[PDB]
Amino acid sequence: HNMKAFLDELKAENIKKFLYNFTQIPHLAGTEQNFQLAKQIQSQWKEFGLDSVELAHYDVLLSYPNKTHPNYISIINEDGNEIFNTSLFEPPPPGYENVSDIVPPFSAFSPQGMPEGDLVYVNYARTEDFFKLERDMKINCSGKIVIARYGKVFRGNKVKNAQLAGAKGVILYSDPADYFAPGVKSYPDGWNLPGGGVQRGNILNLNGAGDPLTPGYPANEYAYRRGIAEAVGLPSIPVHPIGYYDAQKLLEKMGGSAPPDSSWRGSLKVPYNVGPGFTGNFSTQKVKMHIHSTNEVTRIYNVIGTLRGAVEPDRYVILGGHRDSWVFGGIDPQSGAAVVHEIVRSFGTLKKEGWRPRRTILFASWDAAEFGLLGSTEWAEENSRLLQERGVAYINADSSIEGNYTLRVDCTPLMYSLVHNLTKELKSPDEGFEGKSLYESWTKKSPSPEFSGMPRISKLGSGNDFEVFFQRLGIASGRARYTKNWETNKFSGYPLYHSVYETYELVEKFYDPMFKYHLTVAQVRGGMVFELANSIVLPFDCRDYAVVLRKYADKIYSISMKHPQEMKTYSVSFDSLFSAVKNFTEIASKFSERLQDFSNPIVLRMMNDQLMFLERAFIDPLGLPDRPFYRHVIYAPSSHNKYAGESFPGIYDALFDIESKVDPSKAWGEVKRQIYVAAFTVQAAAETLSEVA
Amino acid sequence: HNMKAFLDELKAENIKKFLYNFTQIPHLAGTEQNFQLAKQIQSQWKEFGLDSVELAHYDVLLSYPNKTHPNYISIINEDGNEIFNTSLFEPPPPGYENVSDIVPPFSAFSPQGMPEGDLVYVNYARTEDFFKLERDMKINCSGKIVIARYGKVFRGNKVKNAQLAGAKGVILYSDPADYFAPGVKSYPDGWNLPGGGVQRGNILNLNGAGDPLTPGYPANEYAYRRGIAEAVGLPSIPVHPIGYYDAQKLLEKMGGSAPPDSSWRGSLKVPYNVGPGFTGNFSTQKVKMHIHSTNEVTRIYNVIGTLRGAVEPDRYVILGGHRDSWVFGGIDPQSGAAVVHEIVRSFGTLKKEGWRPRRTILFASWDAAEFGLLGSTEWAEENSRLLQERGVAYINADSSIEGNYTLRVDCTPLMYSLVHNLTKELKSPDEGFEGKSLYESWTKKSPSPEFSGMPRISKLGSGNDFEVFFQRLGIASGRARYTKNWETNKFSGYPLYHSVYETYELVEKFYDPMFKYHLTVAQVRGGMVFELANSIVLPFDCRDYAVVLRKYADKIYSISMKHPQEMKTYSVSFDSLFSAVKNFTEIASKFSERLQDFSNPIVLRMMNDQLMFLERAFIDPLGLPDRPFYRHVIYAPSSHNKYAGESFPGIYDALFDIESKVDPSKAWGEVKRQIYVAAFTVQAAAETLSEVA
Numbered sequence A, B: 001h002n003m004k005a006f007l008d009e010l011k012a013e014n015i016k017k018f019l020y021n022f023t024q025i026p027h028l029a030g031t032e033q034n035f036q037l038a039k040q041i042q043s044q045w046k047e048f049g050l051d052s053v054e055l056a057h058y059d060v061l062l063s064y065p066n067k068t069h070p071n072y073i074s075i076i077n078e079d080g081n082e083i084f085n086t087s088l089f090e091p092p093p094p095g096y097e098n099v100s101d102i103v104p105p106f107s108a109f110s111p112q113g114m115p116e117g118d119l120v121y122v123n124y125a126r127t128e129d130f131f132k133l134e135r136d137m138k139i140n141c142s143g144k145i146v147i148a149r150y151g152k153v154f155r156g157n158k159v160k161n162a163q164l165a166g167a168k169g170v171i172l173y174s175d176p177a178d179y180f181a182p183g184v185k186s187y188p189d190g191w192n193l194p195g196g197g198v199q200r201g202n203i204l205n206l207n208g209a210g211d212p213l214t215p216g217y218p219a220n221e222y223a224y225r226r227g228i229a230e231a232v233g234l235p236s237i238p239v240h241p242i243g244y245y246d247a248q249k250l251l252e253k254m255g256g257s258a259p260p261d262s263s264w265r266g267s268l269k270v271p272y273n274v275g276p277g278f279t280g281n282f283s284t285q286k287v288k289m290h291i292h293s294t295n296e297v298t299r300i301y302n303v304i305g306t307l308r309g310a311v312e313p314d315r316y317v318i319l320g321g322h323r324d325s326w327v328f329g330g331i332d333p334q335s336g337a338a339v340v341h342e343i344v345r346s347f348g349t350l351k352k353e354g355w356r357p358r359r360t361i362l363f364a365s366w367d368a369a370e371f372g373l374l375g376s377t378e379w380a381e382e383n384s385r386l387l388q389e390r391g392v393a394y395i396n397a398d399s400s401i402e403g404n405y406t407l408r409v410d411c412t413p414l415m416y417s418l419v420h421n422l423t424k425e426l427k428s429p430d431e432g433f434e435g436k437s438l439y440e441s442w443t444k445k446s447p448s449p450e451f452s453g454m455p456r457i458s459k460l461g462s463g464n465d466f467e468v469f470f471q472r473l474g475i476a477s478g479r480a481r482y483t484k485n486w487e488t489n490k491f492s493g494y495p496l497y498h499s500v501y502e503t504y505e506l507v508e509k510f511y512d513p514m515f516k517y518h519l520t521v522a523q524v525r526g527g528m529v530f531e532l533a534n535s536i537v538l539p540f541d542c543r544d545y546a547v548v549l550r551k552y553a554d555k556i557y558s559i560s561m562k563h564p565q566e567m568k569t570y571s572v573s574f575d576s577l578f579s580a581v582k583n584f585t586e587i588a589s590k591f592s593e594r595l596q597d598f599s600n601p602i603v604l605r606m607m608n609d610q611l612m613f614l615e616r617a618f619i620d621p622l623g624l625p626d627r628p629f630y631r632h633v634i635y636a637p638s639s640h641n642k643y644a645g646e647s648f649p650g651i652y653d654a655l656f657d658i659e660s661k662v663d664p665s666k667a668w669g670e671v672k673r674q675i676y677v678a679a680f681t682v683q684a685a686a687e688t689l690s691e692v693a
Ligand SMILES: Nc1nc2ncc(CNc3ccc(C(=O)N[C@@H](CCC(=O)N[C@@H](CCC(=O)N[C@@H](CCC(=O)N[C@@H](CCC(=O)O)C(=O)O)C(=O)O)C(=O)O)C(=O)O)cc3)nc2c(=O)[nH]1
Pocket: A201, A202, A332, A369, A370, A371, A372, A373, A398, A399, A408, A445, A446, A456, A458, A461, A462, A463, A464, A483, A485, A486, A487, A492, A493, A642, A643, A644, A645
């Protein structure tokens, strides 16, 4: 009973069977079908051998279209005649044209409204796109309906940016430039997005809060809820997503200013004029949105499985991923959930033979992730005291594949060495690398930008269920999946993301017919969980944090040094931060020496507690400015793109666009405050690794 | 080497020698004399045998009178002639009339100003005193100078209340009613306050923040400081304290309204007229303050001594008390510091013989406590990560005596059983109880209001250095001292508190000639530290928390039930809170069973960690409303009196004066929110005691 036994028990054929099982009907959060799936998973995890398997339910704010009053967009003429209407649904895929309860495309949490106005095209609706419009082009979005292409940044940030520009509505669409790979056919004949395809998704700006009505506390049966007016993160203007056939009809008549440059042009045969409004002949026509979606407090269900530890049952290694989907969830999330299911089955086989892990393993099937990470966040709010004193690590398990090219890992620096070591022991599933390690193929295909002979491992961003564990609670977190070639594939994510076309057949036909990439991902995620839960000494290398901290300090200093005169005027010094990083490096090196130089279980556990609480030490209980649930001082989701991680986010945000601030003394004062907070936090974290007395 | 050996080594004669040594010259925070004392203590603790003894320094905002521009108050006539002036200093006591550097009486952190106006007498300047003035008597304090007697509540609350009433200045004085015990002589012939005596003290409203300029972070060498305008807790109006000879001259001419009842009358031969202003003949006279004190960032020094644990060096039991004094510190704090010194000496004697405690003991000599608990708070801010993951308990050690009648203990319910057990093993020092236990004498003299044959133990309030440990960080805390008879002694604290007369001779002549009460207090504080640091199982009884939680739930429900119609209208239910308390009771009982039913050091330490993190579980990382550093959900300092503890403070404050709120729906909504937070926190704390997996 060792890791090899665990790994060998995992089967591609089982992952395939589970994926098929999980994807025959929609499992939208808050629906009966997703409750039934929760009950099925609960029953199977018990069967598989877990010690306890419970449902944890919460009543959270969700959002749904009105079944009898459909959402749509029109072009309306000067007489009020609606001369063009966007689609009411995606053409369902072959053999699913009679499937009931497919939610039509909508932007979850949009308010209701019927705004009419002139269109402005805002490219990706990024912060810099809006800078270009108002500052350079002198185009005013106030009272306009903005149309933005999906891609580059989280859609909630696009909506926030549009609101702040004064838009009265937002239309999101999928441009073939970003969602149609050259030389591949549209679904069902290939993996591209057809012109009738539409990306669903929520447009909240929760900043880690969880359920909009209950920030800080679980949405249990006696919860006090905020009124809707005080809810966290809701958009103030109506929003709706469309496909590129419909977008073409909205964009083709656009007049006003030409696009500023080629980076504003997608692939449709339209000029990509910014507007506002339509060309001469059509200048009296307008665009009208009709949004009738409703926000509803609705019950959601997490499945929580426990495999009790033999030696340290009060130490938790968590493997979690969500279960709710927009429609069939062929990739997102069921390609992940099928992998978790097989991992539970394998651990359970060992358990039935008399094995237990050293530490407790918790397995989670989260609900309502698509509506803002609600299930994971409410559960973590409920259990925060247990998690912060006992939480060793969190391994996420959403989509197992977004491509078939190579591995992708995003994690805390504390897991780098674990990931390198594990992948050296796993077989590469790649063509041309038969008999080679996954480390070799991954390193060849995705080289580290810093180091020769190492693979790229990214920072954690957000937009997935590790957010509460990592950025709020400070528990070492990681994720892994198979991905595309980022050098040659310039499209955004995978094309059929959050569409009706994301099916079992998509995966089986186009992504992973042999389920070998799924199996490799199960071995990576499961192997990480195995080592974290069973290694005598926790498999964290504090020295890897020291290396990245210096890289991040260099980076933030370099941003600041774009303003040398202001740094002179306001005496802005990074000396404290570099000092703290130098001290962290020294103390980490000495800790590492002791870790290998110590039969004493108290010194061991004392050392294991130092390892465990190291990630915890980067937490500031006061949070980041105006984002109280982003508490990690080294990493937060980018304020411009929830998906991306930002390093030293407090200093980064203080420096961002600083040359535009009206009061430079105040602005640079805040930069100096953030440097102090960061230097202090790095030093305090270092000191947790010093000898304890 | 057991507790008896430790206890037997403590000597009254040593405590006496140390007290004499610590009280010959003033040790005002931020002065050279207090730095020299820090260095002396550091050297002696090393001598005594501690493993390491370091100074931890910070640069914090302090406040001092201007040496060449003295503070004083006048009565001024209509021509601007100052016809009466308050004293510039207290007459120094016999043999100290040539002692240099006695700080004259002042209110630390007063702004500068020379406000002139009509006096209003506001009794104790409590919330209810101001209610009586504005609501019942219809007396407007706006633009008036308020005169308030010291007593009943922390003077910072009096100042806050006066500011909010619109006062332009505050005069604080010591009324003989509150500071002159019948039948006892004034110092030097007895322990009463003479008419020239004055109580120093700060008038901040920090709400746990520490240094006003650096809330959340240690005031280290690279700290970013707030500007004075944004500092935490500073008063907006000038404030000055005076003795009763001077108060008599200010009060005797008072006209306007009669005092509302006898509870507004002190003991001076004046009418205690409320005002505003003086009677007919003197109506054109006014009162003028002259305050020239300055706030100054100043270095302060904590001494931190470590006695490394033999088995659990990463578990900290802390014995701390302050060293800085207003003048000589004969009682406050040196009667406490002398006791800590002897405790360190005793532990060191055992250490030199080869003994070590099981857990690490930290000893602290805090600086700047008199200026707002600054030294303890800055150090805890610096070390917060170590303290919250490793902090077992904090035992405070300010003044050892405030009387000679019986023991006083204020502590977490987690220490009740420890305190009962220890005091049963200690000898009573009381006359008439020779050969009896301290438990017996204490129980006879200060019976529990709830339980026959038990002694009174109070809630922790604040105004002392346990505040950051207990209310911010959630570390089990306690304190003990000898006190007066609360039934027969209706004066406030001890009369010479914070005056020049608080000397070695005061203690040796009047309070404790044999140093037997000091010795008993050393045995209580030291014994608690010994048991906390050496007991195999932590000496905490979670069931005692269950009992008090029910008492507090009953109490807060009873306050709410004063408004039955509103509870019906707004559906205000305490069911969730009582449910949580019932669950806590059940889970605690089961935990206690397991604690006694389990050779396994992991189960032991797992159980010890459950005991240690139980106090920690009452912490809400979001803090209480507008008081982010008061995080404990069960206990906070009263919003009306920092000295007093309040239970379920979030609900208490939501209910306080609720019938006066303009929007009852909003006000009762907030009551229901606080019930939810409290019920959730109690349940979450209970769940930390459940089986871990
Ligand atoms: N030069 C170079 N760079 C590379 N960078 C990376 C890689 C390997 N894989 C990647 C790793 C990181 C990135 C990356 O950093 N991209 C961006 C943004 C950060 C990022 O991770 N972006 C993702 C964004 C997509 C994402 O994370 N999506 C989520 C969506 C889950 C979801 O549906 N969540 C819901 C709810 C979200 C919520 O409510 O919070 C929703 O979004 O609707 C997910 O898949 O987990 C991406 O485009 O690859 C950047 O430039 O900084 C890109 C590719 N390879 C290379 C390379 O070969 N060369």
